[PDB]
Design a protein around this ligand. Sequence first.
Ligand SMILES: C[S@@+](CC[C@H](N)C(=O)[O-])C[C@H]1O[C@@H](n2cnc3c(N)ncnc32)[C@H](O)[C@@H]1O
Lengths: 129, 218
Amino acid sequence: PLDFTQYAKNMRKDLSNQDICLEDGALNHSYFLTKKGQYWTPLNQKALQRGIELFGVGNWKEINYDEFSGKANIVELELRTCMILGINDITEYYGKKISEEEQEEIKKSNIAKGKKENKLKDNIYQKLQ
Amino acid sequence: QGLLQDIEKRILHYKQLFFKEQNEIANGKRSMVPDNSIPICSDVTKLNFQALIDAQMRHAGKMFDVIMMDPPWQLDSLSDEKIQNMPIQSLQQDGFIFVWAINAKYRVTIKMIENWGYKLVDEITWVKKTVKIAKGHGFYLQHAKESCLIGVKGDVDNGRFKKNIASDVIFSERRGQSQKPEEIYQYINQLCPNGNYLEIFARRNNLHDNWVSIGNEL
Ligand SMILES: C[S@@+](CC[C@H](N)C(=O)[O-])C[C@H]1O[C@@H](n2cnc3c(N)ncnc32)[C@H](O)[C@@H]1O
């Protein structure tokens, strides 16, 4: 006669840390599939997208200081940046300051290209070497 | 070794797993975590237990039927006094408490629950199957088990808690230790099913449906 689903959600909202639960109360599995203090907040997702616009690609030491004040691993940044540009080789883009407007354009151009090329795996274009 | 091309091959292969996992996550990949657990990541020294008391009273009529503990005894090194000082008394009013006592702290643990007003009644024994024995270096006797001390306060006369349901002895493997047997939560189910539970110093492995879980590594 008690519903634990609702109970969890209500409890979760008051008690649960921000990243644990969603604004509706339920718990977000993104958090729990990322170890420890390694989960990637949507709020520092815009921070990577903001740093590529200001400092450019591969500027991670440059961009690490500004938007990820101390630590996010620079491996992570270059790995998410190939998420932003829809490509698995980000070599082509290095050192270029890219606007959020452009990044979005590059992403939809590399993805449509890789789908015609049939070189798209996991919404990321596979670039030949 | 001809291994420059090797290393370039592991990198492009490894990134695609990241590009795979993050997409499945974006597409609603579920967690192992069951959907009805209530994880809380705090420091029991820095945590305010009135918030947990208000919220539980609020969305539930009740207070906790069961409390589980695995203190970080210092031998993550929490001061002994500090653990004793947690306001457990206020967290639960009628029911049972479980707390895992390493051999070093078995007597201290008994003092501790008695301090918090429980009456020691039972102890769970967990032997560690090779898969069928356990070799641990005791000072006086080798250790083949750790033990769960069980105290009780209030009216359990209620049908809410069911007597004579469960075992003393648990036989699980030493999974992933330091990690307790799952069939603890099976036993707690038998002892009292569909109840409000609490675990202190819990870890992500611990999280189960209906359980409020507090641990600094959540
Ligand atoms: C005995 S272990 C937990 C093992 C647990 N029984 C299990 O089933 O795996 C000690 C736990 O205490 C937690 N802990 C240590 N210091 C803490 C603190 N100051 N506040 C809250 N939790 C703490 C750690 O997260 C660690 O998970």
